[PDB]
Scaffold this active site. Structure first.
Site, mmCIF file in Angstrom:
data_model
loop_
_atom_site.group_PDB
_atom_site.id
_atom_site.type_symbol
_atom_site.label_atom_id
_atom_site.label_comp_id
_atom_site.label_asym_id
_atom_site.label_seq_id
_atom_site.Cartn_x
_atom_site.Cartn_y
_atom_site.Cartn_z
ATOM 1 N N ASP A 1 43.439 -24.313 -13.335
ATOM 2 C CA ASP A 1 43.986 -22.988 -13.601
ATOM 3 C C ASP A 1 43.337 -22.332 -14.805
ATOM 4 O O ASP A 1 43.332 -21.100 -14.896
ATOM 5 C CB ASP A 1 45.496 -23.075 -13.809
ATOM 6 C CG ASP A 1 46.230 -23.464 -12.548
ATOM 7 O OD1 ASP A 1 45.892 -22.923 -11.474
ATOM 8 O OD2 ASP A 1 47.138 -24.316 -12.631
ATOM 9 N N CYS B 1 37.421 -15.662 -2.529
ATOM 10 C CA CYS B 1 38.759 -15.795 -3.118
ATOM 11 C C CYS B 1 38.843 -15.175 -4.509
ATOM 12 O O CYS B 1 37.942 -15.321 -5.346
ATOM 13 C CB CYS B 1 39.264 -17.238 -3.194
ATOM 14 S SG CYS B 1 40.264 -17.695 -1.745
ATOM 15 N N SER B 2 39.967 -14.506 -4.753
ATOM 16 C CA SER B 2 40.148 -13.632 -5.901
ATOM 17 C C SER B 2 39.242 -12.423 -5.746
ATOM 18 O O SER B 2 39.120 -11.880 -4.645
ATOM 19 C CB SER B 2 39.870 -14.385 -7.203
ATOM 20 O OG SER B 2 40.104 -13.574 -8.332
ATOM 21 N N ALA B 3 38.595 -12.001 -6.832
ATOM 22 C CA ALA B 3 37.749 -10.816 -6.798
ATOM 23 C C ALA B 3 36.382 -11.090 -6.205
ATOM 24 O O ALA B 3 35.634 -10.141 -5.958
ATOM 25 C CB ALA B 3 37.595 -10.235 -8.199
ATOM 26 N N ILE C 1 33.678 -12.778 -7.535
ATOM 27 C CA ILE C 1 32.511 -12.668 -8.407
ATOM 28 C C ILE C 1 32.466 -13.832 -9.391
ATOM 29 O O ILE C 1 31.382 -14.312 -9.748
ATOM 30 C CB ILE C 1 32.479 -11.311 -9.142
ATOM 31 C CG1 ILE C 1 33.697 -11.143 -10.059
ATOM 32 C CG2 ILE C 1 32.362 -10.153 -8.131
ATOM 33 C CD1 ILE C 1 33.767 -9.791 -10.744
ATOM 34 N N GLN D 1 31.028 -15.009 -14.278
ATOM 35 C CA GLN D 1 31.820 -14.157 -15.156
ATOM 36 C C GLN D 1 31.830 -14.603 -16.616
ATOM 37 O O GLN D 1 31.701 -13.763 -17.510
ATOM 38 C CB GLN D 1 33.264 -14.093 -14.635
ATOM 39 C CG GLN D 1 33.485 -13.077 -13.558
ATOM 40 C CD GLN D 1 33.360 -11.667 -14.083
ATOM 41 O OE1 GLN D 1 34.262 -11.164 -14.755
ATOM 42 N NE2 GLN D 1 32.231 -11.019 -13.789
#
Length: 496
Positions: free
Chosen positions: A396, A430-432, A434, A477
């Site tokens: 997480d 999954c998620s944004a 990137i 990121q």
């Protein structure tokens, strides 16, 4: 396109003092956060005082406190510089004047403490016509030296040009005086120095300092650990301003609700265009073809929304993808990442014109494997198996401590892909789409080179990332994901 507003080595107090003395109401800069490393702070001046806004990035996106979520800092700045009235503090504050940084540490051509003999050694082995660098002075403390290679590819030479630092201004001994080394370098790229005998000292490209032989990976990581990782990453981040290609198709009113985050968008020239829908806008999905530069390609996309599920399966069918990589759980710390877009085991569901059967699930410790059969409703000989690899042990917070689970995962994904004739791009999401998506894809590109060419091959992690970022903004990121990419490459080398 400047990105000079990002100051890498400034504190909060120095940010206030720089904006109160050299800036005006509307001047701003961005900097790393000193209270919480890994985050960032946007320092704006308004009504004669400086306010500090928190910018978080845990691995998925830059999140402006009291604002919106963005793929890169450059896009965050560009957005609010043209959308005044949107940045709220709860008064409104404006981004008018980028306070530019004179520290050249994040520049590709700056080397710092470097001797003249070593500068010649590096320009001999890796440089070509026009390669240059700027280093601190050997003979005259405080000054700088510009070392340029000129020749043809004893036909080449290295020329040293002294850069005097007089009263916080820089000059090459005559002519104009510059307030920063960057300004002096940008001047003499456009108007190159000519020698007495006619030699033009062209500054074509900075000297490559990141491409290494795969066998030198352990040495390079140890050098970056004593910090080098942060400097190498921020030098890569400084080049995101060259990747501000058009994303107009995602900005259309008809496609606003097809994005998980209104501002994290695909590029027009790499987005997946969907064909054969229903005649409004049925051609858009927040997805990009990632082509490394058979050859394995990728589709980096976002987690599914409730209203893009049918568009997802259209993309998988149209692009002929046979492997889907899922990098997050359905739910992580109470927030919904990807919505479930697959049927339960043994079940059959229809998503628009597409028909998906979940044939079997296989549960390893790091991931769940789901054998899906995808077909077009009402047609025979359109069925194909699509293998979904759902990675579920990603932490997480941050990156995994051990890259082994990610590598064994990727190794399995690669062999199933290689086993399917005429398989389309591997879908990673999954998620944004990137952060973790970029880290998985970048690792998989580098590990691909080593697997086919062994340990005697050049890798260049920032060059690979930059090439991927040109096809989808914000791929990889955080600095922890950057380090994790190195750790995974090193760990793959050692197990050879």
């Amino acid at each position: 396109t400047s990105r000079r507003w990002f100051h890498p080595n400034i504190t909060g107090v120095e940010a206030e003092n720089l904006l109160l003395t050299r800036g005006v109401d509307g001047s701003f800069l961005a900097r790393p956060s000193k209270s919480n490393p890994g985050d960032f702070t946007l320092s704006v001046r308004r009504n004669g005082a400086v306010t500090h806004i928190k910018i978080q990035n845990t691995g998925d996106y830059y999140d402006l406190y009291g604002g919106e979520k963005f793929a890169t800092l450059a896009e965050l700045v560009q957005y609010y510089m043209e959308h005044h009235g949107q940045l709220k503090e709860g008064d409104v504050i404006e981004l008018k004047y980028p306070l530019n940084c004179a520290d050249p540490t994040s520049e590709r051509w700056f080397h710092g403490h470097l001797s003249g003999k070593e500068a010649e050694k590096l320009l001999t082995e890796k440089g070509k016509h026009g390669s240059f660098l700027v280093r601190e002075s050997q003979s005259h403390p405080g000054d700088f030296v510009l070392s340029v290679r000129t020749g043809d590819d004893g036909k080449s030479k290295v020329t040293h040009v002294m850069i005097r630092c007089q009263e916080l201004k820089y000059d090459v001994g005559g002519g104009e005086r510059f307030d920063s080394l960057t300004d002096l370098v940008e001047h003499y790229k456009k108007n190159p120095m000519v020698e007495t005998l006619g030699t033009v000292l062209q500054l074509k490209q900075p000297l490559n300092t990141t491409r290494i032989n795969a066998a030198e990976i352990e040495s390079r990581v140890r050098e970056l650990s004593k910090q080098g990782f942060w400097e190498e990453f921020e030098t890569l981040q400084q080049q995101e301003c060259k990747l501000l290609y058009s994303r107009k198709e995602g900005q259309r009113q008809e496609n606003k609700n097809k994005n998980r985050y209104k501002n994290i968008l695909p590029f027009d020239h790499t987005r997946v265009v969907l064909h054969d829908g229903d005649p409004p806008v049925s051609d858009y999905i927040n997805a990009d073809i990632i082509m490394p530069e058979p050859k394995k390609s990728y589709i980096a996309t976002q987690g599914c929304l409730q209203n893009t599920v049918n568009d997802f399966w259209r993309m998988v069918f149209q692009e002929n993808s046979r492997v889907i990589v899922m990098t997050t759980k359905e739910v992580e710390r109470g927030k919904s990442k990807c919505v479930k877009y697959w049927p339960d085991e043994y079940a059959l569901k229809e998503y628009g014109v597409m028909r998906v059967r979940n044939v079997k699930e296989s549960a390893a410790h790091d991931y769940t494997l789901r054998e899906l059969k995808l077909s077009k409703v009402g047609q025979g000989n359109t069925e194909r198996t699509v293998w979904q690899y759902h990675f579920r042990t990603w932490p997480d917070h941050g990156v995994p401590s051990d890259p082994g689970g990610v590598l064994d995962f990727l190794e399995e994904v690669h062999h199933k892909q290689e086993s399917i004739m005429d398989a389309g791009p591997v879908v990673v999401h999954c998620s944004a789409g990137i952060g973790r998506t970029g880290t998985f894809i970048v690792i998989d590109i580098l590990i691909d080179i080593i697997r086919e060419k062994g340990v005697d091959c050049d890798i260049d992690v920032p060059k690979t990332i930059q090439m991927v970022r040109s096809q989808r903004s914000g791929m990889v990121q955080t600095e922890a994901q950057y380090r994790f990419i190195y750790m995974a490459v090193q760990h793959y080398i050692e197990t050879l």
